[PDB]
Structure formats: C-alpha cells, structure tokens
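Practice problem. Given the sequence and the SMILES for guanosine-5'-triphosphate, write out the predicted structure.
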Amino acid sequence: NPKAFPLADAALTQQILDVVQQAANLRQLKKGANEATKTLNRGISEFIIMAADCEPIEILLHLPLLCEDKNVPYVFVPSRVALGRACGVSRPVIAASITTNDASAIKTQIYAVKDKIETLL
Amino acid sequence: TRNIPQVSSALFFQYNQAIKPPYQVLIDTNFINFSIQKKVDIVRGMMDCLLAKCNPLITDCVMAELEKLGPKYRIALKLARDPRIKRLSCSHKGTYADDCLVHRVLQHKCYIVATNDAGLKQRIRKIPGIPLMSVGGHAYVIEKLPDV
Amino acid sequence: KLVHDVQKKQHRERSQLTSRSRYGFLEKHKDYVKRAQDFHRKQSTLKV
Amino acid sequence: GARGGAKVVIEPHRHAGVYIARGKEDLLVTKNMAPGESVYGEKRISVEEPPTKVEYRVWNPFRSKLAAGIMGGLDELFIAPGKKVLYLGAASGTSVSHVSDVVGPEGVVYAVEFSHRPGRELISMAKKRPNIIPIIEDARHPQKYRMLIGMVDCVFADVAQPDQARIIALNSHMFLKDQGGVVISIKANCIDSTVDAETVFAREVQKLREERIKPLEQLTLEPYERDHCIVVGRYMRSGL
Amino acid sequence: EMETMEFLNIAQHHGMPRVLGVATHLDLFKSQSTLRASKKRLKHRFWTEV
Amino acid sequence: SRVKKRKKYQKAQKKLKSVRAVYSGGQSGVYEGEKTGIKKGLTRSVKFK
Amino acid sequence: AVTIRTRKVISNPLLARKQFVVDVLHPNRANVSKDELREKLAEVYKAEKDAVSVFGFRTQFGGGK
Amino acid sequence: RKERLKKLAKMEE
Amino acid sequence: MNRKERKSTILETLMGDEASNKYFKRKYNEIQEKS
Amino acid sequence: GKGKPRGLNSARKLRVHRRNNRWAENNYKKRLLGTAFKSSPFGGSSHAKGIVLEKLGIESKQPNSAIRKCVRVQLIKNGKKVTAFVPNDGCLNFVDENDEVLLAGFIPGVRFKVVKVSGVSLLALWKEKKEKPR
Amino acid sequence: PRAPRTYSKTYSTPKRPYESSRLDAELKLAGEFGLKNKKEIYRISFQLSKIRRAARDLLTRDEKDPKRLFEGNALIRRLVRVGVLSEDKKKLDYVLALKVEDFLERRLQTQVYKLGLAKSVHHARVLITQRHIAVGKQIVNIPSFMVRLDSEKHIDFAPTSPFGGARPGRVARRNAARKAE
RNA sequence: UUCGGGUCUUGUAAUUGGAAUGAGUACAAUGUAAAUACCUUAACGAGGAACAAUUGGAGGGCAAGUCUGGUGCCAGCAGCCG
Ligand SMILES: Nc1nc2c(ncn2[C@@H]2O[C@H](COP(=O)(O)OP(=O)(O)OP(=O)(O)O)[C@@H](O)[C@H]2O)c(=O)[nH]1
Ligand SMILES: [Mg+2]
Ligand SMILES: [Mg+2]
Ligand SMILES: [Zn+2]
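Answer key:
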C-alpha cells in the first residue's frame, strides 16, 4: 500500500548491506539513482536497492517501474544514512545497483540475497 | 524456406559443457536386458559408473517395446516401472524407439544415452556432445564423458 | 620422416639473360603447361 | 549506423506483417498503427506513398524477444495479420505495440499484465492502438478475465515465472483454438538456476506435451540474449 | 679448449685409445656451489666425447 | 607450455564465433541495426519431428 | 627495529637453567646474529652473556621472522 | 577445394 | 545527420563521405593497373 | 550335474583336476618350463649384436629405395646371417664392413633394424651429435 | 637402516587421453584458469575422484551408521572449509555433484585475479610466483595454493613487494639513477 | 561426395613504452661437529629478455638439377648434388 514497497526487515537489511559493501570493494556497485537508472537501461543490473526514508520518496519511484518492466528484483531498506555508509562513500545514498558479473568473487553471496528479494516481491 | 539447425550453445566444439552432475540418462530397451544378464542394478550401476546421481528416463516408445517383448522379459518390465525411473511423453506416431532416442538428443544436448545396440551406437557417435553409456563385462562403461 | 631441413632447401629459379632481355621473360615448365593447355582447348574446339 | 536523415529501402519479410529496411545495415520493421509517435523511443521510417505519408517503426532485437526470434530464423509464427493474439506478460507497449502492428486493424491483441505500475503505461499505449485490450490481471487465474477475452488464434507467453507452464496451459484450455499456436519465451534462470539451461529447456518441452501442446521448433536467442529460447508449438486438443 | 676437442676427434677417427680426463686449476674456484656445477657440466660434456 | 595453451585457447574463442552465435554482452549504445544483414529465407530453429 | 620474544619457558633445575623458544621479528633486515641475540637475552634475563646459549634459528619463508 | 580434393583422394585411397 | 549532409538518394550521401571516396579512388586504380 | 563334483567335501578332487588340466594350455606349458623365448626374434633378448658383412643395395640406382637401406648382418651369438634395415640411405654411410651393430625388432622378410654402430646410436650420428669411434 | 618415508602420486593419466571431447574440455579449462599443462588438470581430477568415490561408499551405507556419520561429517566439513562446498549444501548428495571447476576456482591464482589484484589469470600467476602476494602475514608463491573461506579476505600485496609499500624493484631504481645521472 | 553453404573485427612478415622477477654472482648472517645447501638478505644480475626446452609424429613446396617407364606436354621414384 505505501509507495516504498517491499521494505526489508531488520535481518534482511543487514544481509543486503553486507552484499553492498562487498560489491563496493570489488568495483561491482553503482551508487546514486542516476547511475542506477543507466544500469537498468543497459540491462547490467543484478538488482536494485532503494532507501525508504528518501526525502521526498518520489525522486526514486521511477526505478521500480524500470525494474518491473525489465524483470529486475528491487528492495527498499529503511535508512539512506546506513545505505550510503555501506556503499563506501561519505554521503547518504538513496539508490544503489549491483552490476551483473558471473565471474565475480561474490557471485554466490549476491545470488543468495537476490533469491530472498524475489520471495519478498 | 531452407533450414540449417543452429549448433547447440552447450557445445564448445566437441565438448558438451552442459552435461554436469546429476546426470539424465535415456534408457534403451536392450540396456535393461543386458543389465539383468550381468546382475547390474540400474540405479546403483549408474552411480558406480559415474560417481554421481543419475536420473534414468524411459520414453513411451521404449516402454511399448518392453511390453511387446512378452512374458520372457517380465523381469525387465518390472524394473522399468521402478518409481525412481521417470517417464518422457512422446508426440510422434511411430513406436520405433531408436529414431525416438536419436531425435531427442538432437533436440537437447543434456542426455546420456544408455544402449548396447550396434546400429544405434554409430548413429549416436556421429552426433557431437552425446555421451554413450553401455553395459559391458561386469559393469557399465561410458565413452564420451570428459568428467570421469 | 628421416629428412633434415637442409634437404628441403629452396632451389631458386634463374631469369632471362641480360643480352636476351628484349625477347622477354624466360619461360619455365610451369609457364609452358598454361599455354600448352590453352592451345589444346582451341584445337579441340576448332576440330569440332 | 542508421542515422537520422538516412535513406533506406523497405521490402517485405518472409513473415506477413513484418518488413526489412535495407542499407549499409539491415533493420527489422513493422508498420506503425499509430503514426507520428514512438512508443519506447525507437527509430521510425517515413515513406511517401500515393501522397499520404506512411510510417514504420524499428523493431529492436535486444529489447523484444520475439524480434530476437525473427532474427534467429523462426520457421512458423502464428502472429500474423487478422489474428487474435493473447499476449501474456505485457509489461508495457514495447513488444505488444509491435505485435499490434503485425496483426493490424483487423486483428486484436489481449495484453495481460499483473503489476500496476507497468499496467498504467500499457493502458495509456492501448488508447492510441484500438486493437489492444489491456487486461491488468494475474495470468495465474484466467477465470478472472473470461468475460473480457474470446477465443484466440495464438497465445504468446513471456511470463518470467517458475510455474509458467501451468499458466500457459490454463489460458490455452479456455481461450486457444484447436490447432492454435503457442509461442513461449523461456528464461532458464527464472525457472531453475540450479541446473543448466539445456536441462530446463528439455523439462519445459515435456510439460507442454503433458498439456496436449505439440512443440514444432525451438530456437535459442544468442547473440541478443543468454540462456533464452523460444519454443513454438501447436495446441492439438483432439490428440497428439 | 679447441685443441682438447681437436685431439679427441683425431683420436676417434684413427682408433680410440684409453682416454682419461684430468681436471686441473680447480683451486681457482672461490665458491663450492660453482665448483660443483663446473665439475658436473665438465664431466657430462666429457661423457659425450668418451 | 602455459603461454602456448593461452594462445591456443584465445584462438579457439575466435573460431567458436564462426561456428555459432555467441552472446557478447548484448547492446552497447544506440541500436544501429544488423551489421551483416538479414537473410529472409533462412531458418536456424531446431525442428521437432 | 628488532623485537625478541621468549615463549614456552621451562625452569629446569636438573640442568640448572631456563629453556625457551625465541621469536625474532626483524622487519627490513636479513636476520639477527646469534651473538647480538645472546647479548639482548643476557640483558633481559639479567645474566652474564656467557650463561646464555642460542641455537637452531630458521628464518620463515618470506623473511622478517 | 583443389587442396581439399587432393586430400580426399588420399583418404579414399 | 546534419541537414546539409542529408541527400535525397543513398548514393549522393555516399559521395559526400570523404573517407569512402579516398578508398574507392585507391582501390579503383589498383584494379585498373592489374587489368 | 555339469560333469564336475559339487559336494561340500570334494575340494581335493577339484584341486587335483585343475592341476592336471592346466598343462593343456601352451602358454602355461611354456611358462612353467621356460621355453617361452624359443619363438623370440633374438632367443630371449631385446637386441642382438651383429657384424656387418656387406651392403646389398649399395649398387641400386634409385635413391632411398627399400633395397638401398638393406644390409647383411651375421649374428655373433650363433653366427646365422640376417638382413637389417638402416633408417635411411644417408645413415648407410656410417655403416661399413666388419663393424659391430646392435639390432632391434622392426621388402618383406627383413625384420630387424640397426640402432647402434660401433657402440653409438645411428640417430646420434645422423643428427651430428657424436662421432663414430674407430 | 632408518625407517621408510611415505610418498604418493598426486595424479593419474586418464582412461582415454585422446578423446576429442576430453581435449576440448582440457583446452577450455587450461585457458579459463591459466594452467600450465594437463598434469594439473589430472591432479585435480584425481583428488575429485577420490572424494566422490568416498562419498559414494558412504552413501551406500545406512543412515545413522557410525562410520557414515563420522566420515561423511569430516568430508563435508573439509569441503566447506576449503570453500568448494556451500554452507547450504552440507550433504553427501551435493558432494557427489561437485566438479573440477569448483576446485579450480579456489586456487590462489584464480582468487588473485578475481579480487582485482591482477588483470588476468596469467598476470595473477606471474604476481604469485614473483613474491608479490601475501595471504595474511605469509608470502605464498605457490599458484596451486587452495584458499579457505577465512583466508579469502586476507589476500593482499606483501609488505616486501614494491606494489605493497616497499621501495621500487631493481628496474625502477636503475632507471631513476640513470635519469638523474 | 559434387551442388556449394554458414558467419563476422580479423590479420600483420608493423613500430613502440617502462614496470616486475629469479637462474646466477655475492658483503653478511643463519644453518652445521665443521661445512655445503635451503630459508633470509646489502650490492650486481633481461629484449634475440643469445640468461638461446626438449622429445616424438603428420604434411607440403621448390631447380636451365638427377634416375626410370611410356599412345607427344605425362607418370613413378625421388631431389644437401643446379
Ligand atoms: N693454481 C694452480 N696452478 C696450476 C695447476 N696445474 C698447474 N698449475 C700451474 O700452472 C703452471 C704451468 O704448469 P706446467 O706443468 O708447466 O703446465 P704445462 O702444461 O706443462 O705448460 P706448457 O709445457 O708450457 O705448455 C705452473 O706454474 C703450475 O704451478 C693447478 O691445478 N692449480
Ligand atoms: Mg645424459
Ligand atoms: Mg624480496
Ligand atoms: Zn517416442
């Protein structure tokens, strides 16, 4: 019913933020809604993470539309302060995108979170 | 319009990079008969041959042949109906089984073919990326399977 | 295969004499088979 | 490549309702049912014919799996002019608009979608195309829109769901004609990532046989997609 | 040296007598590792001619 | 031997492109059409008998 | 700098001594000579250098210890 | 083709 | 394409391309020399 | 029955029967009596020493003909004369009359090849890696 | 005399080395993982064959059998620790599903390439043999070194390496000295 | 098998850069009964990186060359030799 949906629980939020930090270290993370949008256009997004506390929430509501058209999983986390910190940057992040790579060192970890997000949707 | 079937994307030249454990095996009618003659259990015999779980499969054509064989081969029919053996439907008029198996491996490069028929084995050998299982000696033998 | 690489050395073909330069390229066997074959084609058709 | 003011030669494809634009590069093209505008930002080709200005749209094989089917050389397509088509998985007008172009004014497309956000764009696009009936409903429960759909010539399924075989079976038993066409786009990862694509493609073909659907041809969609295939079958309700 | 190999080839073609190798000036080596390597290489090359 | 097998493998990747279509990341940039052309009368689908 | 640590110390009055394993951290240095180790061990244990004996030192692969 | 044929002559023979 | 570069025919645009003209001139001369 | 005893106490008869019958195989008979090397090419050895008598093909016209590569050899163990093959006509220069040759298994009827001459490999001589000592 | 020291062969030649499918599989493997020869592939296949034969024998035994429990648990724990077997697949049935690529992905060469310290598997091999890589505090110069789950996040450039914070190698300082001169 | 067919960044016998490292040499220490070596490590030590991997196998091509036969120009054998 609320615009930011589905919102991950506390346990899933930590598991999501774990993968975001690893992808940051391996150069497999795109930070910001603008960069996230380009990944969807190129079809190189493994899934999308959004911040539910964005002010206003509407500036990132184009992303779920692009995802559902492209059949890309997406999920909302409660805090952009926490999302940006785990992204490795010094500022809040409202949206991030895990880039597709079947030759990545964190492939198993990424697919584990992706499977749970599909269950959430 | 002319038709040239595409090469399967599961093939790296002569190597089938799709067939990985657990395996799916298409059983031929005579494979069951030679299996009984050598006292080789189908599920255990395949698990010993490949060191992996094998998912044996019997098509309608093969099941029809086993039934037409008669009372002499009663044992083979009962073994064919073991619940661990799954069944594949056929949508072609003929009950000839050798052509049925050859068409399936042409369509999908994911099956091992288990057969002792001399004619069928040459036909399968020409199709690239198709491992060929058979019972010889005391146990099963597999030819074109690099993972072994 | 008991051959050495020296045994398989390239033998180089000679060219027309300078004094004979005005007469043109010095024909060799591979050249001759082309005009020998071409002539036979004309004579066979011309006979028919 | 195919820049703005370039000139091309438009000739028909082997398939009715489908065209090829020649040049230094070749393009797959369908005639625009709603001329003057693009649905998803594709290039358009204008031809002056006796003089009225007819328009054409470029069909991108990287955006549409059906177009990837045309490029790869499918033998039979039941989507043709003057046919009713049930399109399952119509996220928006990206590929339904091209299917609407092929069937033409005389045919119709029943575009079924579930999610509401893509459904809004599907409804908006359908207003420009009178031959599209947008049905924002779950394809797992065809009973919910039986009033809205009649008997149909072809069923096209792009639902990227693990239980897509059931959905295609349920919709065909109600709405598809005997000897009708079925065209499924299969994505191996969605159904079973644990096994290889070839195992998935074989399994889906077995489920179709179980549902009185006779497969006719199978095609894999490289270089446009990875681990994707299109299976074309015929609905033989009498017997296989 | 060249004249060592020259004698051996003269000997090989006129009837090989008993040939016994004597290595001298081995005190000039400063390392034991290099001394052993020289002896091994020297011995095995001698083993081709004899 | 390592260098020899590296050159053998990269050579085989080139030849694989001449045996079948291979996915190479998809679309990059604006879509510019089929560069080698479209053949109207040729089908590559595997047909069930 | 060079660090010296002693571990597994056994007081052995049967032989009138203390026995132990010696770890030497010597970053950016080839190794530490037995003489200088004896001097430092004599310093830390408050014994004459003649009463200290060190042996069996193996540098770790990669160096530095 | 000419090079090919000369090799078919070998496998035939 | 810029408006001035656009031409009614496909060929007239191809003449405009300077790189194409240079290649055709070079390739044409070589064939005539061989001929 | 199958013509053999089957009783639980007939092990002696089964054993004694097998020992008597095992002598029927020629392989068993040759193996036990040590006569398996009578049919050997060299009477039990892998190589044979020989003396080069004369070169049968040295006067043939066509180069590298099968006859040109033949040599007559006298085996030193028993003195019987045989024919051996040399790898090529070039290797024929290293072979000369009255030289010791080592033969190994290989114009039908010629069934040996020369592998060493004067204690040196012919292939080593052919590759110019050794000199034949005289 | 002194007691014998044990030794064993770590590989075995395959049944039919000349099958075309086998040669193509070996080509793809050696190319994708940067292997030197077929003997490395044979070594890994030998280990995997031993493991899967052990799992087969244990699966033949009755569930709750003491030997089955003990040895199957040991094997599963080892495979999970080395990273080949996932934490969610702790059963002998998934032990029978393992493949050579699962073991090849755990080699230090592959890990060094994947973590981004090298631009290819061959650059990774060169970096490892040239003493540039450390697992924790230890320089490892063995490409076939098998990385554990805990060891994965500790792969780095060694303190002594010019890429790890030390002074430049001979080439760099030779060039700098000549440029200064 | 002829009929031909399929497909697209491929080829170069082209130029060019400065980074890495140990075989080896070697202060030294370590090691050892004393040594040698290994493991450490100053200083040296790579572009034909001549700091010069091997061992078997398959198949060509060439001359004002040589030998043999024969329904002309071919065929066979062969070719370190013109
Ligand atoms: N250091 C060292 N000097 C040696 C050795 N053998 C010979 N010498 C020296 O080398 C010099 C030559 O020794 P000679 O005995 O005369 O050798 P040579 O072969 O007779 O020399 P020529 O007759 O002049 O051709 C002498 O000063 C020897 O002391 C050796 O093993 N070590
Ligand atoms: Mg030797
Ligand atoms: Mg160092
Ligand atoms: Zn059938």
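Check your answer against the key. Chains B and I do not touch (no CB pair under 8 Å).
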